[PDB]
Amino acid sequence: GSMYLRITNIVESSFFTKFIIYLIVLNGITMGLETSKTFMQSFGVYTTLFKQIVITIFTIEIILRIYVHRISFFKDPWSLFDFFVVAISLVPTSSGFEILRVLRVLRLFRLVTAVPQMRKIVSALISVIPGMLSVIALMTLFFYIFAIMATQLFGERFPEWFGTLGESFYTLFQVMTLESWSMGIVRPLMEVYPYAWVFFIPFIFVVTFVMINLVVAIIVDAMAILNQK
Amino acid sequence: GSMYLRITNIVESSFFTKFIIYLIVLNGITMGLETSKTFMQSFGVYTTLFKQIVITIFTIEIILRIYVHRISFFKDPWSLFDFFVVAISLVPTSSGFEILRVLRVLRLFRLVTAVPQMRKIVSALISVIPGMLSVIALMTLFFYIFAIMATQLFGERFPEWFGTLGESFYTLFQVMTLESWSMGIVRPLMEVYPYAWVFFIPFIFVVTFVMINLVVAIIVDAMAILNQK
Amino acid sequence: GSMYLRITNIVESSFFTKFIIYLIVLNGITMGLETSKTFMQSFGVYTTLFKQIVITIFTIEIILRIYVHRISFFKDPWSLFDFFVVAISLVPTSSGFEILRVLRVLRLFRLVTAVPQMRKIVSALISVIPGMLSVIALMTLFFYIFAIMATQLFGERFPEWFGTLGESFYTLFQVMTLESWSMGIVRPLMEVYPYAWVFFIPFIFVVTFVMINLVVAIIVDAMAILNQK
Amino acid sequence: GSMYLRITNIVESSFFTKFIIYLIVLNGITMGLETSKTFMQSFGVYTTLFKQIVITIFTIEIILRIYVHRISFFKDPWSLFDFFVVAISLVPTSSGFEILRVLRVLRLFRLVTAVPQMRKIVSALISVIPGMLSVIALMTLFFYIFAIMATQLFGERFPEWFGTLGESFYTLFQVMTLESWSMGIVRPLMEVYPYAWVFFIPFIFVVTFVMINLVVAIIVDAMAILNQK
Ligand SMILES: CCCCCCCCCCCCO[C@@H]1O[C@H](CO)[C@@H](O[C@H]2O[C@H](CO)[C@@H](O)[C@H](O)[C@H]2O)[C@H](O)[C@H]1O
Ligand SMILES: CCCCCCCCCCCCO[C@@H]1O[C@H](CO)[C@@H](O[C@H]2O[C@H](CO)[C@@H](O)[C@H](O)[C@H]2O)[C@H](O)[C@H]1O
Ligand SMILES: CCCCCCCCCCCCO[C@@H]1O[C@H](CO)[C@@H](O[C@H]2O[C@H](CO)[C@@H](O)[C@H](O)[C@H]2O)[C@H](O)[C@H]1O
Ligand SMILES: CCCCCCCCCCCCO[C@@H]1O[C@H](CO)[C@@H](O[C@H]2O[C@H](CO)[C@@H](O)[C@H](O)[C@H]2O)[C@H](O)[C@H]1O
Ligand SMILES: [Ca+2]
């Protein structure tokens, strides 16, 4: 169309995409100030008014660029994200949870979508994630199995830490991060169950070894790429 | 045999091995629910009945596939494991410790045996372990030597941490993981023995250095393999 | 000039640059003793007298070598540093903050400027920093976004940790370092907000993954250099 | 000599060196039991008698093999070690400190000297240490500079942590290991000095970055060796 091409050379234009990047950064400062109580008592109104100005601007633009690109728009990871955070954003406050108001703050991630240098590095990081899946598999299972013995051994006498399969899952996640694993968990346990270290000193070893391998794994696969290039 | 070949094309068949993978996952959910007290009051019976249905199914199948494969079955790492967790499983409750009931939960690791993609990655992880043996050697010795001085210096005045060669071994294992090493151990010690940091700041250095090397070691040996391939 | 060349073969001479390296090390021992209260009661005077002897010596030499090298001197990173720590040093005590007196202690970093082997390794370390910028970018943004939800969710009931966008930034920096993240932060939170782990167990994962990549990233880029050499 | 060659084919013989490896392991078990109080009340005598049997055996053998090898013996790292732990060992108890009795326990490291596979890996680990010297240099200096400001800023109001240049050095060593750096140090400080995070959040960054580089450094230098081989 003699206009469909005038609409595309608008949307696909630099100024338009660079414009909503200046409207991203102007909004991220606003979210920053809006947490201030002092700022909110004075400049609260402008702000909440400013916040409606943008959301129609984006719904304008999410409408424009979904028209420009029709059904291709919907098989794009970045675009779908922009659709699903604007959508999230459009449903208003005091309806349902208000946790959605705090989730609205995800729309800042658009700056990663809109900025190419940023979508590059995010594609790097995600490019890594298929290779580690089998380890994440094995690993999840391993946690599962130990959550179950740990509950079965300790949940009745240590209910804050092991009375639930999830309570155990969590504590175990923490012990893996080595976070007060001894003085705060294993050591308190050996006051009652004195051979508790048999369960944890092995558990630490396996998940640390598995981690070390997971990482050497990334570093070797990052290397097949260099020699191949 | 005109049947030994009908028994092999059963056992070695996809549906049969994929069948006991669906009987693995159905059992792992059951172990999950069985930790719940609510679930156990209602659906306890079905469950404990379900648990006997499987164990005869596996002892059926561990019998079948030990017949199909005779004495080869017994020099296979995965198969031996399946024999030794089913065996563990067959001895019943309220005999000996009941810690064996919690050890029964190891039979979930069959999912790593039955799933090829999973036995692949487990063979990777174990493939690594010969190379690090000399470091694990040196390392064990080093811990040993320090357990002995640490007991000899601190066990009489700090018996929860150093009165035993093992008590020391453990605390030292913990200090290596940097887990409250200072605010919870070395610092409390310098209230009595003020030059205790002479023992620990060196000890941290050596075991951290040895670890860093152990890891660079894995990463270099993972590299001889790439250029060789 | 028949003297400009006699001034250059002084400044650019070994003995002159090696001289102010012996005047660096003599001064760093002095700063060391000067923290002692005993030393300061006796040898305080000599010392504070000694400290004025050097600062005129350096302002002598910073004047000489800025003359020898005119405006080239001012586009050199090491030289500019030497200018800006001597300058810092020249403004005296009891004027403004006295935090500048503690900042005077930065002039020890001249030993890294004056010693080539040392400016080599510092140029290595800084040589690394362009490549990680996009990750430091993404990363800063990510922290920002979570500071804002974390304040919005927890600052009213946990003001020491989340009542400020910065208070949150800090706590979050700490949680990233895994430092009492559970027993000291997330666990205290679940006494009031029981699904707080939904915010933190994801947050730990993302920033740990991003870190692992940041590091594998350094190691791969250090490798393009070897094959290229 | 018609005997100097009979003395060398003794010392240099397998059985002789393998003999004192069985006398090493028999002694290391003895040190292990000797920490037990029960064992020492019964079998104490045998033991302390056993301990004199070996020390003359080694002084026999350290005499033999210093004769076999004359002055070459004294420029060998492993041999010198064996001389200097036996020497340490020969001076008896209740003279000077008794800390030397606990230092006698170092003679177990002979097992690393006597076992080739073990002296191999120890030579690997030490082979690494020249390359990191410039970083250990820079690093020591950096710690030094911060010890001095940290004392100058905090030692008067926090004397257990910063009243000494060494007290500071230690605390700083601990903060580097991230060990309760926040909840136990920086956080307690901001109750008095509220912009203390300006000193520590930078300090953590620099020493973590320097560490990451130190390690990528080992991994790259371990790689020049592979392509060169
Ligand atoms: C952008 C999308 C991101 C999707 C994220 C995908 C999840 C990836 C899982 C990686 C994170 C696992 O979570 C984290 O793993 C590290 C591995 O460094 C482990 O952490 C522990 O062991 C490793 C051993 O290698 C050490 O490096 C680390 O210092 C220690 O704390 C813990 O298990 C946990 O802190
Ligand atoms: C599937 C079978 C598995 C068999 C397991 C074989 C055991 C292998 C030993 C490796 C585990 C040693 O146990 C663990 O080692 C790590 C090394 O990362 C050390 O951990 C500490 O030092 C290292 C330095 O490299 C850091 O990476 C780590 O963050 C820190 O906590 C501790 O010593 C201990 O937490
Ligand atoms: C000389 C000038 C220096 C300029 C400094 C530039 C800043 C560079 C940023 C690197 C430092 C980031 O700060 C530090 O990052 C490490 C990454 O190891 C993270 O630390 C955590 O995760 C990583 C996972 O890789 C683990 O290695 C580490 O043991 C764990 O504590 C934390 O986020 C923080 O402790
Ligand atoms: C056999 C002789 C041995 C001689 C020993 C020579 C000393 C070598 C110095 C290396 C040890 C430095 O001491 C240790 O360094 C590690 C680096 O992993 C740092 O540790 C911290 O930062 C690093 C970042 O890389 C992380 O890997 C680590 O999990 C974290 O705790 C600390 O600074 C200290 O725990
Ligand atoms: Ca900790």
Side-chain angles (χ1 to χ4, degrees), chain A residues 1-228, chain B residues 1-228, chain C residues 1-228, chain D residues 1-228:
Chain A
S2 174
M3 145 202 180
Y4 180 91
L5 203 51
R6 316 310 107 90
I7 291 200
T8 295
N9 302 344
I10 288 164
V11 153
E12 302 283 309
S13 56
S14 61
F15 184 78
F16 173 69
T17 55
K18 184 189 65 63
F19 169 72
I20 63 170
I21 294 183
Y22 285 168
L23 275 201
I24 280 285
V25 170
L26 258 299
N27 194 221
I29 309 187
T30 301
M31 311 254 256
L33 298 121
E34 263 202 335
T35 84
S36 158
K37 197 192 106 185
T38 306
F39 182 85
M40 274 297 97
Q41 305 254 355
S42 313
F43 294 54
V45 277
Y46 313 70
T47 298
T48 52
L49 181 272
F50 189 117
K51 310 215 122 194
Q52 310 149 340
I53 268 48
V54 289
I55 192 182
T56 56
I57 284 198
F58 291 6
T59 38
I60 288 325
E61 159 217 335
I62 191 79
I63 275 159
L64 253 48
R65 106 185 204 212
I66 192 171
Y67 155 62
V68 191
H69 296 269
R70 327 148 320 284
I71 193 190
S72 76
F73 165 85
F74 266 139
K75 48 171 297 181
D76 189 61
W78 320 95
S79 296
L80 271 171
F81 184 97
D82 292 5
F83 169 80
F84 274 141
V85 288
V86 174
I88 271 169
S89 176
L90 274 182
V91 50
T93 83
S94 300
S95 60
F97 307 117
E98 204 229 351
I99 199 173
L100 283 102
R101 169 174 179 260
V102 317
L103 275 36
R104 292 172 186 179
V105 86
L106 288 199
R107 96 168 47 83
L108 251 52
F109 278 119
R110 211 147 179 258
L111 194 61
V112 158
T113 279
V115 178
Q117 307 120 311
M118 286 292 92
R119 49 216 289 220
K120 180 174 187 177
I121 173 61
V122 172
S123 303
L125 303 185
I126 305 186
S127 99
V128 194
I129 290 205
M132 27 189 277
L133 284 190
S134 57
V135 157
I136 292 151
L138 175 60
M139 195 59 170
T140 311
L141 167 62
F142 190 74
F143 257 78
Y144 190 64
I145 304 173
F146 272 79
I148 302 188
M149 332 185 48
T151 279
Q152 274 203 5
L153 296 165
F154 310 119
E156 214 203 13
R157 295 196 176 181
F158 288 83
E160 322 265 319
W161 305 335
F162 301 104
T164 282
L165 189 65
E167 262 146 30
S168 288
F169 253 92
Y170 170 84
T171 292
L172 284 184
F173 175 81
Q174 155 192 336
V175 162
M176 175 180 39
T177 86
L178 300 193
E179 202 286 88
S180 324
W181 75 261
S182 148
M183 296 276 158
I185 295 191
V186 176
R187 229 148 197 158
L189 288 186
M190 297 177 299
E191 288 153 334
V192 193
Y193 305 141
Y195 296 111
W197 61 272
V198 181
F199 183 91
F200 285 101
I201 311 287
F203 172 84
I204 306 180
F205 271 85
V206 162
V207 308
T208 307
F209 187 52
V210 154
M211 280 297 118
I212 299 170
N213 277 287
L214 173 146
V215 167
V216 188
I218 314 308
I219 317 159
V220 164
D221 273 47
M223 282 321 171
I225 301 314
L226 271 204
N227 44 96
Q228 278 324 316
Chain B
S2 174
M3 145 202 180
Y4 180 91
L5 203 51
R6 316 310 107 90
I7 291 200
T8 295
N9 302 344
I10 288 164
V11 153
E12 302 283 309
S13 56
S14 61
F15 184 78
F16 173 69
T17 55
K18 184 189 65 63
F19 169 72
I20 63 170
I21 294 183
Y22 285 168
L23 275 201
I24 280 285
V25 170
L26 258 299
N27 194 221
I29 309 187
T30 301
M31 311 254 256
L33 298 121
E34 263 202 335
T35 84
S36 158
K37 197 192 106 185
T38 306
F39 182 85
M40 274 297 97
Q41 305 254 355
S42 313
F43 294 54
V45 277
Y46 313 70
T47 298
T48 52
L49 181 272
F50 189 117
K51 310 215 122 194
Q52 310 149 340
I53 268 48
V54 289
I55 192 182
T56 56
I57 284 198
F58 291 6
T59 38
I60 288 325
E61 159 217 335
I62 191 79
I63 275 159
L64 253 48
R65 106 185 204 212
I66 192 171
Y67 155 62
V68 191
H69 296 269
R70 327 148 320 284
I71 193 190
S72 76
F73 165 85
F74 266 139
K75 48 171 297 181
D76 189 61
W78 320 95
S79 296
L80 271 171
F81 184 97
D82 292 5
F83 169 80
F84 274 141
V85 288
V86 174
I88 271 169
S89 176
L90 274 182
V91 50
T93 83
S94 300
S95 60
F97 307 117
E98 204 229 351
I99 199 173
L100 283 102
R101 169 174 179 260
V102 317
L103 275 36
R104 292 172 186 179
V105 86
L106 288 199
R107 96 168 47 83
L108 251 52
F109 278 119
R110 211 147 179 258
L111 194 61
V112 158
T113 279
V115 178
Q117 307 120 311
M118 286 292 92
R119 49 216 289 220
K120 180 174 187 177
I121 173 61
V122 172
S123 303
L125 303 185
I126 305 186
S127 99
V128 194
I129 290 205
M132 27 189 277
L133 284 190
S134 57
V135 157
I136 292 151
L138 175 60
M139 195 59 170
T140 311
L141 167 62
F142 190 74
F143 257 78
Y144 190 64
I145 304 173
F146 272 79
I148 302 188
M149 332 185 48
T151 279
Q152 274 203 5
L153 296 165
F154 310 119
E156 214 203 13
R157 295 196 176 181
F158 288 83
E160 322 265 319
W161 305 335
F162 301 104
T164 282
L165 189 65
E167 262 146 30
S168 288
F169 253 92
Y170 170 84
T171 292
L172 284 184
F173 175 81
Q174 155 192 336
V175 162
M176 175 180 39
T177 86
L178 300 193
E179 202 286 88
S180 324
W181 75 261
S182 148
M183 296 276 158
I185 295 191
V186 176
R187 229 148 197 158
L189 288 186
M190 297 177 299
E191 288 153 334
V192 193
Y193 305 141
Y195 296 111
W197 61 272
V198 181
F199 183 91
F200 285 101
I201 311 287
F203 172 84
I204 306 180
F205 271 85
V206 162
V207 308
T208 307
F209 187 52
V210 154
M211 280 297 118
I212 299 170
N213 277 287
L214 173 146
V215 167
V216 188
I218 314 308
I219 317 159
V220 164
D221 273 47
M223 282 321 171
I225 301 314
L226 271 204
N227 44 96
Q228 278 324 316
Chain C
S2 174
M3 145 202 180
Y4 180 91
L5 203 51
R6 316 310 107 90
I7 291 200
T8 295
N9 302 344
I10 288 164
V11 153
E12 302 283 309
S13 56
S14 61
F15 184 78
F16 173 69
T17 55
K18 184 189 65 63
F19 169 72
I20 63 170
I21 294 183
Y22 285 168
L23 275 201
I24 280 285
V25 170
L26 258 299
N27 194 221
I29 309 187
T30 301
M31 311 254 256
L33 298 121
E34 263 202 335
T35 84
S36 158
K37 197 192 106 185
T38 306
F39 182 85
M40 274 297 97
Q41 305 254 355
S42 313
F43 294 54
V45 277
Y46 313 70
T47 298
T48 52
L49 181 272
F50 189 117
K51 310 215 122 194
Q52 310 149 340
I53 268 48
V54 289
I55 192 182
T56 56
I57 284 198
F58 291 6
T59 38
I60 288 325
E61 159 217 335
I62 191 79
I63 275 159
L64 253 48
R65 106 185 204 212
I66 192 171
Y67 155 62
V68 191
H69 296 269
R70 327 148 320 284
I71 193 190
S72 76
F73 165 85
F74 266 139
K75 48 171 297 181
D76 189 61
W78 320 95
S79 296
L80 271 171
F81 184 97
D82 292 5
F83 169 80
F84 274 141
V85 288
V86 174
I88 271 169
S89 176
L90 274 182
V91 50
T93 83
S94 300
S95 60
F97 307 117
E98 204 229 351
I99 199 173
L100 283 102
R101 169 174 179 260
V102 317
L103 275 36
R104 292 172 186 179
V105 86
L106 288 199
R107 96 168 47 83
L108 251 52
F109 278 119
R110 211 147 179 258
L111 194 61
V112 158
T113 279
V115 178
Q117 307 120 311
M118 286 292 92
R119 49 216 289 220
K120 180 174 187 177
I121 173 61
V122 172
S123 303
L125 303 185
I126 305 186
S127 99
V128 194
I129 290 205
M132 27 189 277
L133 284 190
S134 57
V135 157
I136 292 151
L138 175 60
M139 195 59 170
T140 311
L141 167 62
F142 190 74
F143 257 78
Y144 190 64
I145 304 173
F146 272 79
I148 302 188
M149 332 185 48
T151 279
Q152 274 203 5
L153 296 165
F154 310 119
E156 214 203 13
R157 295 196 176 181
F158 288 83
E160 322 265 319
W161 305 335
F162 301 104
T164 282
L165 189 65
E167 262 146 30
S168 288
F169 253 92
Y170 170 84
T171 292
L172 284 184
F173 175 81
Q174 155 192 336
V175 162
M176 175 180 39
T177 86
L178 300 193
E179 202 286 88
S180 324
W181 75 261
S182 148
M183 296 276 158
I185 295 191
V186 176
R187 229 148 197 158
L189 288 186
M190 297 177 299
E191 288 153 334
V192 193
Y193 305 141
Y195 296 111
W197 61 272
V198 181
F199 183 91
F200 285 101
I201 311 287
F203 172 84
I204 306 180
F205 271 85
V206 162
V207 308
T208 307
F209 187 52
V210 154
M211 280 297 118
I212 299 170
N213 277 287
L214 173 146
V215 167
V216 188
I218 314 308
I219 317 159
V220 164
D221 273 47
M223 282 321 171
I225 301 314
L226 271 204
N227 44 96
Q228 278 324 316
Chain D
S2 174
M3 145 202 180
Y4 180 91
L5 203 51
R6 316 310 107 90
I7 291 200
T8 295
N9 302 344
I10 288 164
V11 153
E12 302 283 309
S13 56
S14 61
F15 184 78
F16 173 69
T17 55
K18 184 189 65 63
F19 169 72
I20 63 170
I21 294 183
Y22 285 168
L23 275 201
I24 280 285
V25 170
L26 258 299
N27 194 221
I29 309 187
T30 301
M31 311 254 256
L33 298 121
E34 263 202 335
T35 84
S36 158
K37 197 192 106 185
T38 306
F39 182 85
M40 274 297 97
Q41 305 254 355
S42 313
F43 294 54
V45 277
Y46 313 70
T47 298
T48 52
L49 181 272
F50 189 117
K51 310 215 122 194
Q52 310 149 340
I53 268 48
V54 289
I55 192 182
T56 56
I57 284 198
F58 291 6
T59 38
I60 288 325
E61 159 217 335
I62 191 79
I63 275 159
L64 253 48
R65 106 185 204 212
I66 192 171
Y67 155 62
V68 191
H69 296 269
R70 327 148 320 284
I71 193 190
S72 76
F73 165 85
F74 266 139
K75 48 171 297 181
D76 189 61
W78 320 95
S79 296
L80 271 171
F81 184 97
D82 292 5
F83 169 80
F84 274 141
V85 288
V86 174
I88 271 169
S89 176
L90 274 182
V91 50
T93 83
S94 300
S95 60
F97 307 117
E98 204 229 351
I99 199 173
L100 283 102
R101 169 174 179 260
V102 317
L103 275 36
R104 292 172 186 179
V105 86
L106 288 199
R107 96 168 47 83
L108 251 52
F109 278 119
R110 211 147 179 258
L111 194 61
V112 158
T113 279
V115 178
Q117 307 120 311
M118 286 292 92
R119 49 216 289 220
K120 180 174 187 177
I121 173 61
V122 172
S123 303
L125 303 185
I126 305 186
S127 99
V128 194
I129 290 205
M132 27 189 277
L133 284 190
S134 57
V135 157
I136 292 151
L138 175 60
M139 195 59 170
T140 311
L141 167 62
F142 190 74
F143 257 78
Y144 190 64
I145 304 173
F146 272 79
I148 302 188
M149 332 185 48
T151 279
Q152 274 203 5
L153 296 165
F154 310 119
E156 214 203 13
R157 295 196 176 181
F158 288 83
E160 322 265 319
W161 305 335
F162 301 104
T164 282
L165 189 65
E167 262 146 30
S168 288
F169 253 92
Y170 170 84
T171 292
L172 284 184
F173 175 81
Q174 155 192 336
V175 162
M176 175 180 39
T177 86
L178 300 193
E179 202 286 88
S180 324
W181 75 261
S182 148
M183 296 276 158
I185 295 191
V186 176
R187 229 148 197 158
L189 288 186
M190 297 177 299
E191 288 153 334
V192 193
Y193 305 141
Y195 296 111
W197 61 272
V198 181
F199 183 91
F200 285 101
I201 311 287
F203 172 84
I204 306 180
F205 271 85
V206 162
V207 308
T208 307
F209 187 52
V210 154
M211 280 297 118
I212 299 170
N213 277 287
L214 173 146
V215 167
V216 188
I218 314 308
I219 317 159
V220 164
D221 273 47
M223 282 321 171
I225 301 314
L226 271 204
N227 44 96
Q228 278 324 316

